[PDB]
């Protein structure tokens, strides 16, 4: 019963959340290699900054 009423209550607010999450997730998903290279270069630069 709890699951039934939870789904009945949260259903109208789910489509917009799914759409927004999908779009924002794809924003990084379509640039995976760029993001990973950015993280590696940022690791090098931030290590240089922190050590000094």
């Amino acid at each position: 019963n709890v699951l039934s009423e939870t789904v009945d209550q949260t259903s109208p607010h789910l489509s917009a959340a799914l759409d927004g999450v999908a779009r924002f997730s794809e924003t990084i998903g379509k640039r995976d290699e760029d993001v990973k290279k950015l993280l590696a270069s940022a690791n090098k630069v931030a290590t240089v900054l922190g050590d000094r």
């Binding site: 760029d34 290279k37 950015l38 270069s41 940022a42 240089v48 000094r52």
Partner: protein, 49 residues
């Protein structure tokens, strides 16, 4: 943002050794000048006068 930041960061990484050494060298130079700042400032003012 990702593209430009990645470009700048790989540019810095290509000179990572020099970028690391220049911070230490600049700190050493600035400390050496700050330890004598007052004579240096007085000398500059005297030269101008």
């Amino acid at each position: 943002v990702i593209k430009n930041l990645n470009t700048v960061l790989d540019t810095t990484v290509r000179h990572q050794k020099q970028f690391d050494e220049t911070l230490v060298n600049f700190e050493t130079l600035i400390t050496g000048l700050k330890n004598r700042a007052d004579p240096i400032a007085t000398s500059v003012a005297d030269i101008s006068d």
